[PDB]
Amino acid sequence: QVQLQQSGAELMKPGASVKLSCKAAGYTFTAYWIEWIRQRPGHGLEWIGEILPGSSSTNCNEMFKGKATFTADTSSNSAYMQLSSLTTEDSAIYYCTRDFSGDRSNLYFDVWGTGTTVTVSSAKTTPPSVYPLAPGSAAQTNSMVTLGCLVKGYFPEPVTVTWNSGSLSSGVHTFPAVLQSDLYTLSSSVTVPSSTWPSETVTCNVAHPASSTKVDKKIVPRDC
């Protein structure tokens, strides 16, 4: 049971400092470098730096000079990385892993933490506006009909979207959120047989726990 346990997700204002932690169990804590890795959304892995506890010995990628400070606490088996002067471009997942101080090939970067997400933003908590997406009265094809809802202007992630409380999930696409201003927007679509609709209701269920928002939006036929 070698484990590396990372601290939880963080939201921080631009310019603040965050301190992340990586808590080790199942091995001699002093015998391994703790390694810190960054992954920006949709980008590759980058190496940030390392510390050998408890020693003065740390190292880092030059890109992170003035940005990342490593410390370690042998009593609680914990290593820390502090990121100072946060900007938007610090928003990423941060992973820790370990690297044996010695001469054994299989103990280099062998176990990985599951990551800590940092989000940097000035935004305040904001509930989503939820809008129905009904067809503008087209051919409605011949076989299937596609409906959606648009979930707009919320902060922070995440929202949950369901269709008919989770019963209808087969024809569904919920798209990743994107930043509109400093706020998030996503949409979800469902494709159902045209027999099904407007015959009867289709409803999207939107939840935003961070604002304590729960909403139902029935997709109502335009008829103009």
């Binding site: 390694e35 992954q39 590759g44 892995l45 980058e46 190496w47 390392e50 190292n59 880092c60 990628n61 030059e62 997942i93 992973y95 892993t97 690297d99 090939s105 299989n106 280099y108 970067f109 062998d110 176990v111 990985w112 599951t114 990551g115 506006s129 809008y131 129905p132 997406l133 009904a134 067809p135 503008g136 009265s137 087209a138 299937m144 596609t146 959606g148 648009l150 707009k152 696409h173 798209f175 990743p176 959120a177 994107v178 509109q180 927007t185 996503l186 949409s187 679509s189 494709t191 335009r222 008829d223 103009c224």
Partner: protein, 214 residues
């Protein structure tokens, strides 16, 4: 610092096929190269260490090798769970560095997008804003172009796109495109069209509505 040049950056293959990925080191790294696999939920897992050794509990279809400055990870026969991302890592000399990654995608039969367009909701209109939404669903391959037209003219400002990952059941991609305007700019115009260009048809799929049509 040592540079790891990873190729290909993307690759399509089918179940049961053999693939290999290559990291070119810019200076000698010895046997000091790991291979890593990252799942869509973000889990990173070491596969190969010291160029050629298999991690415990890693399936035998994975293997690693070197030839000169070129290090490779080979998957003898693809299984469906292998279609994720892979990175090499040199730990010869700090700063440690990764190659840029490879995303493996499943080959499948070309499919045309199902395109749907949506007018702004009346609730949205009463806010001050008007979003027009286009869904381009279940296409393969992933390369797609969306264009918005307003009263016949191409519109580029205000267009936000979002893409799903390859779907695990049918292996298609889906895409939403959203055009956001003020209420007033929206009502200054009549026809709204989203146009999808895709390999599966020589001419674009085109969906429109007219807001003066009800």
């Amino acid at each position: 610092d040592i540079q790891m040049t990873q190729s290909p950056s993307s690759l399509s293959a089918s179940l049961g096929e053999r693939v290999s990925l290559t990291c070119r080191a810019s200076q000698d790294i010895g046997s000091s190269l790991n291979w890593l696999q990252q799942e869509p939920d973000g889990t990173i897992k070491r596969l190969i260490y010291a160029t050629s050794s298999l991690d415990s509990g890693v399936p035998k279809r994975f293997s690693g090798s070197r030839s000169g400055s070129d290090y490779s990870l080979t998957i003898s026969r693809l299984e469906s769970e292998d279609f994720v991302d892979y990175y090499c890592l040199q730990y010869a000399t700090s700063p440690y560095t990764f190659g840029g990654g490879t995303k493996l995608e499943i080959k499948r039969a070309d499919a045309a997008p199902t395109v749907s367009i949506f007018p702004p909701s009346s609730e949205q209109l009463t806010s001050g804003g008007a979003s027009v939404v286009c869904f381009l669903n279940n296409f393969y391959p992933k390369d797609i172009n969306v264009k918005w037209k307003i009263d016949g003219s191409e519109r580029q400002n205000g267009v936000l796109n979002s893409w799903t990952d390859q779907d695990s059941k049918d292996s298609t991609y889906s895409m939403s495109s959203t055009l956001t305007l003020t209420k007033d700019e929206y009502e200054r115009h009549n026809s709204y069209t989203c146009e999808a260009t895709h390999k599966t048809s020589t001419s674009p799929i085109v969906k429109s509505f007219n807001r003066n049509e009800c």
